[PDB]
């Protein structure tokens, strides 16, 4: 059992809505694929540049620590009880989805700690933290895009699945049901007119005879 | 002549409704799905048409007419709200622009204050032509002020919070009746333009 | 008067609009998933299942008055906030919710 | 939405000493634990890096960006490969005293498949 | 009187099926997709109903049978299996949980064991309500133990592999003759409750 | 010949392609957003509203010819660059740019 009358008008709006949503999901999947490709290249370029920039500051800090003549990392690790450079979470709508972004904020609460008091030997420890403090901003700003790239790569699979499923499951049920409903409604509508015309022709033929 | 029609031939596109809709000159929409949300009569802007608007615009515009400019923007805002509502549920929303959200928010208030009505009261079912033209002109001026303020740089929540009591007074000004003044126009509609200009100027900055 | 309240059709119109919003939210959320549904669509979808499994579920010989059905409809109708409903007046809606 | 401002660092004592000198993380008093893991070549256990990475990734929801070296993440690549959430985000970087390789990126492997 | 109906052109909207289904009080379902799997006639709750099932389950469930609880839970799981299969086909299996997969496997096992009538070694024999009550109680106990075992921590492949010979022994139970030690309870279905309790206890720890 | 120009089909093809690209960019602009749209989709979206409200819009007693519609199509197509139109000749495109 199924409804025969008033079904094509209800199925036509769902067929047109699925026909527009398939093209909209295809365009959004194409733009998300292009942004995923550009973020895929920029993540590798920023990963290599952040890798070399981190390796240069690590080599300079290791050369300053080896040139000092003491374990500055032990007193520097115990002397650290607060951070200076932080990040703020915010939602950025790019390509029709919410992406993760990081905004660097500089607060004057975490200054240089009094942990270098060897006279002339504290200058290399001050210059190493002065170079690493400016060196960490390129690594944080270059590493901030991974949360948006992981979100776009996560959304690209759902858009690619919905773009195929919405185009695959949409048209055939409403097309076959609308064609069968119109095909049954055509003969069901013509049968009453044919029976009425045959009844009128039989009534006129019976009335004409004696 | 106001005659109601209903299909009985087994379809919405029968020859009785097609001949009655083709022979008629005025269009008044009515949906059963839109009437279930307490919005009877839910008229359709795409199927609505009027041929005597040009002839009636000479005398009605000769007296005090402003219905055409807010009516075309109201029909375009209703069509854009229907297209955004169908595209949002069809494609799936993961973000929303302030221009389409302002038109959908103005279309929801226009559909609530205009589409929402009853046939047993006079406070929320009776409104004059000057009060309805002033309310539609205030809603079209608020939609044009929100669209002009959104183009200069602003958020949707900052625009709605910048409006504030203007949309609540314009939406809450449909339950009263004419009992003040010496004419159909009231003083509450004229004072809403000065607060709407300051709210539109403060909502932009 | 004296056998039913005046706010019967006001809760019935908001219940029918919440049921149509729950059916449209279930039909729109059935195809794509949990992306096209809003905050009111999930409350109308849960209110359609709770109202369909609470008010429709009853015995064959049980009876109840109009005040018990209006109190059960008012208790089952408290699943959506008052800032997203427009099929009732604020005076009758503020007194009984 | 802002729900974290802590920065995690997983590297050696030189990179953690320079990053702690410039400032990327600290020790929060609400948890009573540090926000960085000091690693040593052939001195620290492999289970401590997976326990600190699992405790920083799953036992804490206040970290925004957690850095991890590819050399220290190579021994814990099985546990690090199971995490795909961006809260906190994981960024694979080259460790000091080793060469950079793009195949050691866990996000690049899943991001490369079905691009 | 049990009379089956068929369409005149392939559609069920004919007056014979509509008049016979409307005038009758009990309906028997039939799935075209389930008939391709050698499970014809396969229908649980979606294409069939019975008004006398309450009085039949109350009269036959008085002394010997306990069919109403497992028939109600099996009808609810069979009704939820269509929404779980439609949600798994439309959206995918990532949004679904382990309870929908366990209910989908229990609906496929109960549908394959109950709807299936053609064997692979010989024709199926007679089976009373007491013989099907042990299979429905074993499927309800396996679905309840599988759903309750996943709450305390357990893999789906470990429980599905922990079932093992219960599905193969439950499939070959209809091929054997009845009265193999008892008329209301059988000795083959008693081992599935202890094996499901041992697999549920071993799957938890 | 003698009452209509030869570039009416070439300007109508680029106007129809710009109208279809503006119709697709208008619906794709709401789903994509104001910060994720293409560069040509914004000029095509503005050319769809300008061509719709300049070429399609006309008075009830406003007469027009083929030269006025060809000049209006060239004036509406002048917002697009020379590298975005390839359905016209370079002499007629550079002469009536």
Curated annotation (Swiss-Prot), chain A:
List UniProt keywords, sorted A-Z.
Hydrogen ion transport, Ion transport, Membrane, Transport, Vacuole
Q: Which domain of life is it from?
A: Eukaryota
What molecular functions are annotated in GO for this chain?
A: proton-transporting ATPase activity, rotational mechanism
Q: Which GO terms describe its biological process?
A: endosomal lumen acidification; Golgi lumen acidification; proton transmembrane transport; vacuolar acidification
**The keyword Transcription regulation is assigned to this record:** no
**Membrane topology summary:** Peripheral membrane protein
Q: Where in the cell is it found?
A: Vacuole membrane
One GO cellular component this record assigns the protein to is: vacuolar proton-transporting V-type ATPase complex
User: In which family does this protein belong, per the annotation?
Assistant: Belongs to the V-ATPase D subunit family.
Q: What does this protein do?
A: Subunit of the V1 complex of vacuolar(H+)-ATPase (V-ATPase), a multisubunit enzyme composed of a peripheral complex (V1) that hydrolyzes ATP and a membrane integral complex (V0) that translocates protons. V-ATPase is responsible for acidifying and maintaining the pH of intracellular compartments.
Misc. comment:
Present with 8500 molecules/cell in log phase SD medium.
Q: How is this protein organized at the quaternary level? A: V-ATPase is a heteromultimeric enzyme composed of a peripheral catalytic V1 complex (components A to H) attached to an integral membrane V0 proton pore complex (components: a, c, c', c'', d, e, f and VOA1). Interacts with RAV1 and RAV2 components of the RAVE complex, which are essential for the stability and assembly of V-ATPase.
Q: What is this protein called?
A: V-type proton ATPase subunit D
Organism phylogeny: Eukaryota, Fungi, Dikarya, Ascomycota, Saccharomycotina
Q: Which gene encodes it?
A: VMA8
Curated annotation (Swiss-Prot), chains B, E:
Phosphoserine is found on 62
Would you tell me the protein name for this molecule? V-type proton ATPase catalytic subunit A, 2nd part
- Source organism: Saccharomyces cerevisiae (strain ATCC 204508 / S288c)
Please give the first and last residues shown and the length of the full protein.
867 to 1071 of 1071
Curated annotation (Swiss-Prot), chains C, F:
Highest rank taxon of the organism:
Eukaryota
Compartments in which it is found: Vacuole membrane
Recorded family membership? Belongs to the ATPase alpha/beta chains family.
Additional remark text: Present with 131000 molecules/cell in log phase SD medium.
According to the record's subunit comment, the protein's assembly and interactions are: V-ATPase is a heteromultimeric enzyme composed of a peripheral catalytic V1 complex (components A to H) attached to an integral membrane V0 proton pore complex (components: a, c, c', c'', d, e, f and VOA1). Interacts with RAV1 and RAV2 components of the RAVE complex, which are essential for the stability and assembly of V-ATPase.
Instruction: Please explain the role this protein plays, according to its UniProt record.
Output: Non-catalytic subunit of the V1 complex of vacuolar(H+)-ATPase (V-ATPase), a multisubunit enzyme composed of a peripheral complex (V1) that hydrolyzes ATP and a membrane integral complex (V0) that translocates protons. V-ATPase is responsible for acidifying and maintaining the pH of intracellular compartments.
Q: What is this protein called?
A: V-type proton ATPase subunit B
What's the source species for this entry?
A: Saccharomyces cerevisiae (strain ATCC 204508 / S288c)
Question: Which gene name belongs to this protein?
Answer: VMA2
UniProtKB/Swiss-Prot annotation, chain D:
Tell me the membrane topology, using the record's own terms.
Answer: Peripheral membrane protein
Q: Looking at the record's lineage, which domain of life comes first? A: Eukaryota
Give the Gene Ontology MF terms in alphabetical order: proton-transporting ATPase activity, rotational mechanism
Tell me which Gene Ontology terms the entry assigns under biological process: endosomal lumen acidification; Golgi lumen acidification; proton transmembrane transport; vacuolar acidification
Q: Cross-referenced InterPro entries, in alphabetical order?
A: ATPase_V1-cplx_f_g_su, ATPase_V1-cplx_fsu_euk, ATPase_V1_fsu_sf
Annotated compartments: Vacuole membrane
Q: Name one Pfam family in it.
A: ATP-synt_F
Keywords for this entry?
Hydrogen ion transport, Ion transport, Membrane, Transport, Vacuole
Q: Which GO terms describe its cellular component?
A: fungal-type vacuole membrane; Golgi membrane; membrane; proton-transporting V-type ATPase complex; vacuolar proton-transporting V-type ATPase complex; vacuolar proton-transporting V-type ATPase, V1 domain
Quaternary structure and interacting proteins, as annotated: V-ATPase is a heteromultimeric enzyme composed of a peripheral catalytic V1 complex (components A to H) attached to an integral membrane V0 proton pore complex (components: a, c, c', c'', d, e, f and VOA1).
Q: What does this protein do?
A: Subunit of the V1 complex of vacuolar(H+)-ATPase (V-ATPase), a multisubunit enzyme composed of a peripheral complex (V1) that hydrolyzes ATP and a membrane integral complex (V0) that translocates protons. V-ATPase is responsible for acidifying and maintaining the pH of intracellular compartments.
Database matches in NCBIfam families: V_ATP_synt_F
Q: Supply the PANTHER family for this chain.
A: V-TYPE PROTON ATPASE SUBUNIT F, VACUOLAR ATP SYNTHASE SUBUNIT F
Concerning its family, UniProt says: Belongs to the V-ATPase F subunit family.
Q: What else is known?
A: Present with 4050 molecules/cell in log phase SD medium.
């Amino acid at each position: 059992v199924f409804p025969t009358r008033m079904t094509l008008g209800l199925m036509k709006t769902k067929l047109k809505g699925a026909n527009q949503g398939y093209s909209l999901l295809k365009r959004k999947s194409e733009a998300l694929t292009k942004r995923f490709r550009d973020i895929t290249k920029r993540i590798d370029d920023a990963k290599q540049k952040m890798g070399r920039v981190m390796q240069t500051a690590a080599f300079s800090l290791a050369e300053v620590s080896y040139a000092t003549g003491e374990n500055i990392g032990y007193q520097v690790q115990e002397s650290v009880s607060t951070a200076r450079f932080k990040v703020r979470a915010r939602q950025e709508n790019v390509s029709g989805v919410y992406l993760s972004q990081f905004e660097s904020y500089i607060d004057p609460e975490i200054n240089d700690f009094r942990l270098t008091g060897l006279g002339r030997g504290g200058q290399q420890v001050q210059r190493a933290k002065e170079i690493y403090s400016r060196a960490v901003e390129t690594l944080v700003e270059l590493a901030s895009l991974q949360t948006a790239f992981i979100i776009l790569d996560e959304v690209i699979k759902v858009t690619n699945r919905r773009v195929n499923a919405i185009e695959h499951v949409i048209i055939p049920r409403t097309e076959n049901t609308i064609a069968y409903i119109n095909s049954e409604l055509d003969e069901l509508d013509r049968e009453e007119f044919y029976r009425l015309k045959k009844v009128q022709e039989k009534k006129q033929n019976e009335t004409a005879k004696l | 002549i106001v005659a109601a029609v209903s299909p009985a031939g087994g379809d919405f596109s029968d020859p009785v409704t097609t001949a009655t809709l083709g022979i008629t000159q005025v269009f008044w929409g009515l949906d059963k799905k839109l009437a279930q949300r307490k919005h009877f009569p839910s008229i359709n802007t795409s199927v609505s048409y009027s041929k005597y608007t040009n002839v009636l615009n000479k005398f009605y515009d000769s007296n005090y007419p402003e219905f055409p400019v807010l009516r075309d923007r109201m029909k375009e805002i209703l069509s854009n709200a229907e297209e955004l509502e169908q595209v949002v549920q069809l494609v799936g929303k993961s973000a929303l622009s302030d221009s389409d959200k302002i038109t959908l928010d103005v279309a929801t208030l226009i559909k609530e204050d205009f589409l929402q009505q009853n046939g047993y009261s006079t406070y929320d079912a009776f409104c004059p032509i000057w009060k309805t033209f002033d309310m539609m002109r205030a809603f079209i001026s608020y939609h044009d002020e929100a669209q002009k303020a959104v183009a200069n740089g602003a958020n949707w929540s900052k625009l709605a919070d910048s409006t504030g009591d203007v949309k609540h007074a314009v939406s809450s000004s449909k339950f009263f009746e004419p009992s003040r003044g010496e004419k159909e126009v009231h003083g509450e509609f004229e004072k809403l333009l000065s607060t709407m200009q300051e709210r539109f100027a403060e909502s932009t900055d | 008067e004296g056998m039913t309240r005046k706010d019967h059709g006001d809760v019935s119109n908001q219940l029918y609009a919440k049921y149509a919003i729950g059916k449209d939210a279930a039909a729109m959320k059935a195809v794509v998933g949990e992306e096209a549904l809003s905050i009111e669509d999930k409350l109308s979808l849960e209110f359609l299942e709770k109202f369909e499994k609470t008010f429709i579920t009853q015995g064959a010989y049980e009876d109840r008055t109009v005040f018990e059905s209006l109190d059960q409809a008012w208790s089952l109708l408290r699943i959506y906030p008052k800032e997203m409903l427009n099929r009732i007046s604020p005076k009758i809606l503020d007194e009984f919710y | 939405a802002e729900k974290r401002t802590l920065i995690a660092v997983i590297a050696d004592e030189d990179t953690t000493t320079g990053l702690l000198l410039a400032g990327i993380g600290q020790i929060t008093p609400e948890t009573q634990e540090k926000n960085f893991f000091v690693y040593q070549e052939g001195k620290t256990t492999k289970e401590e890096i997976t326990d600190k990475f699992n405790h920083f990734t799953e036992e804490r929801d206040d970290i925004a960006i957690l850095l991890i070296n590819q050399h220290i993440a190579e021994n814990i690549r099985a546990r690090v490969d199971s995490f795909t959430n961006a809260f906190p985000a994981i960024l694979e970087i080259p460790s000091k005293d080793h060469p950079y390789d793009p195949e050691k990126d866990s996000v690049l492997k899943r991001v490369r498949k079905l691009f």
